[PDB]
Design a protein around this ligand. Structure first.
Ligand SMILES: NC(=O)c1ccc[n+]([C@@H]2O[C@H](COP(=O)([O-])OP(=O)(O)OC[C@H]3O[C@@H](n4cnc5c(N)ncnc54)[C@H](OP(=O)(O)O)[C@@H]3O)[C@@H](O)[C@H]2O)c1
Ligand SMILES: NC(=O)c1ccc[n+]([C@@H]2O[C@H](COP(=O)([O-])OP(=O)(O)OC[C@H]3O[C@@H](n4cnc5c(N)ncnc54)[C@H](OP(=O)(O)O)[C@@H]3O)[C@@H](O)[C@H]2O)c1
Ligand SMILES: CCc1nc(N)nc(N)c1C#C[C@@H](C)c1cc2c(c(-c3ccc(CN)cc3)c1)OCO2
Ligand SMILES: CCc1nc(N)nc(N)c1C#C[C@@H](C)c1cc2c(c(-c3ccc(CN)cc3)c1)OCO2
Ligand SMILES: CCc1nc(N)nc(N)c1C#C[C@H](C)c1cc2c(c(-c3ccc(CN)cc3)c1)OCO2
Ligand SMILES: [Ca+2]
Ligand SMILES: [Ca+2]
Lengths: 157, 154
C-alpha cells in the first residue's frame, strides 16, 4: 500500500484555527477534489467532524473514543495502526488528509506529498511538520486567485 | 514561458470521435478543472468551438479562417499565439485538440496524461511522446470507467 498526504499550508505555517481552515482560496479546493476522487482518506476525528462525509470519497477515521458514524462510506478505527492494517486488505492507496495530529503521526510513513502553499498569513493554532529530508519536489504550478496559491508534489527518495 | 499539455487518452490511443470525447469517466474532469484554474489554455478552433469557454479560464485560440468574450484571444497561427502569450503570461497549457497536440508536443515541458480504461470508436489520436519525457507521478482512480493520471517531465 502506498500512502499520499494532501494539505494546504499558509505562508506562516498555519493550517487550522480550531475547527476551521482560516482562508478561502478560490480554486484550490479543486486540487483536493480531484486528487481525492473515489479515494480512501485517512483523517483524524476532529477533521472528520468539521469536513463531514463528502460525496465520492471513502473515509478511515481514527478516534480513541466511542465516536461513530452510520455512513456506509465511513469506517471508524481505534488507532492509526488498525486503520492501516485494515485498509491494506482493500486498497493499495490511502491519502492522509489531516488534521495536524494525523499529519504529525504519519509524515514519516508517506510516499508522496501534495502541498498547496497559500499566500496568506492567518491566525491559528494548528501547524504542519517539517518535510523530511528525503522528499524532493517533482512538479510545481502557480495559481493566481483571490488568494494566490502554489501547488507542489513531492516524492520520497 | 513554460508550456504544459493536458489530455485524456483512451487505451487504444483515441482522444476524439468527430467533435466529441467518446467516453465519460466520472471524476477525471476534476483533474482538468483543477490544473487549468485561472490559467491560459492554448486550443485549436475545433476544440474551442466544440467545448465553449469554461469560466475562470483564459483562452488563446488558433484559426486559419473565426471570432469571439474578453477572456478569449484569437490568433492566425501558433507562432503568433506563442509570441503574444510570452508577453502576458509565464505559463500556457496546451489543451487540444489532436492537431494542436501534434504541432506542439515537441515544444512542451510538462505532460498531464490521464489514461482512460476504454476502447472507443473515434478518429482523433494523440501524437507519439518524445523519448525525453519521463513520468514523475502516477495515481490510479476507480470509477464508472477507470483512469490513471500521470505527470511527465521533459
Ligand atoms: N489542508 C489544511 O489546511 C487542513 C486539512 C485537514 C485539517 N486541517 C485542520 O486541522 C485541524 C484539526 O487538526 P487537529 O490536529 O486538531 O485534529 P485531527 O488530527 O483532525 O484529529 C485529532 C483526533 O484524532 C484522534 N487521534 C489522533 N491520533 C490518534 C491515534 N494514534 N489513534 C486513534 N485516534 C487518534 C483523536 O480523536 P478523539 O479525540 O476522538 O480520541 C484526536 O483527538 C482543523 O482546523 C482542521 O480544519 C487543515
Ligand atoms: N481527450 C482529450 O483530452 C481531448 C482534449 C481536447 C480535444 N479533444 C478532441 O480532439 C478533437 C478535436 O481535435 P482536432 O485535431 O480535430 O481539432 P483542433 O486541434 O481542436 O483544432 C483544429 C483547428 O485549429 C486551427 N489550426 C490548427 N492548426 C493551426 C495553425 N498552425 N494555425 C492556425 N490555425 C490552426 C484550425 O482552425 P480553422 O479550421 O478555423 O482554420 C484547425 O481546423 C475533438 O474530437 C475533440 O473532442 C480531446
Ligand atoms: C469493501 C470495503 C469497502 N469499500 C467501500 N467502497 N466502502 C466501504 N464501506 C467498504 C467497507 C467496509 C467494512 C465492511 C469494513 C471493511 C474493512 C474493515 C472494516 C473494519 C474493521 C475493523 C474495525 C474496527 N472497528 C472497523 C472496520 C470494515 O477493515 C478492512 O476492511
Ligand atoms: C476529458 C477532460 C479532459 N481531461 C484531461 N485530462 N485533459 C483534457 N484536456 C480534458 C479536456 C477537455 C476539453 C476538450 C473539454 C472541455 C469541456 C468539456 C469536455 C468534455 C469532456 C467529456 C465529455 C463527455 N463526452 C464531454 C465534454 C472536454 O465539457 C465542457 O468543457
Ligand atoms: C480544500 C482544502 C484542502 N486543500 C488541500 N490542498 N489539502 C487539503 N487537505 C484540504 C482540506 C481539507 C479538509 C479535510 C476540509 C475541511 C473542511 C471542509 C472541507 C471541505 C472540502 C471541500 C468541500 C467542497 N464542498 C467542502 C468542505 C475540507 O469543510 C469544512 O471543514
Ligand atoms: Ca496508532
Ligand atoms: Ca502547425
Amino acid at each position: 500500500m502506498k500512502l499520499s498526504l494532501m494539505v494546504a499550508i499558509s505562508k506562516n505555517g498555519v493550517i487550522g484555527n480550531g475547527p476551521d481552515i482560516p482562508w478561502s482560496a478560490k480554486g484550490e479546493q479543486l486540487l483536493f477534489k480531484a486528487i481525492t476522487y473515489n479515494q480512501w482518506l485517512l483523517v483524524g476525528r476532529k477533521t472528520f467532524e468539521s469536513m463531514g462525509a463528502l460525496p465520492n470519497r471513502k473515509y478511515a477515521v481514527v478516534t480513541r473514543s466511542s465516536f461513530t458514524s452510520d455512513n456506509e462510506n465511513v469506517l471508524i478505527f481505534p488507532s492509526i495502526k488498525d486503520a492501516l492494517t485494515n485498509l491494506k486488505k482493500i486498497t493499495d492507496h490511502v491519502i492522509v488528509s489531516g488534521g495536524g495530529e494525523i499529519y504529525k503521526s504519519l509524515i514519516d510513513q508517506v510516499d508522496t506529498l501534495h502541498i498547496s502553499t497559500i499566500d496568506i498569513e492567518p491566525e491559528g493554532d494548528v501547524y504542519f511538520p517539517e518535510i523530511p529530508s528525503n522528499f524532493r519536489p517533482v512538479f510545481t504550478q502557480d495559481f493566481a486567485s483571490n488568494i494566490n496559491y502554489s501547488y507542489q508534489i513531492w516524492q520520497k527518495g
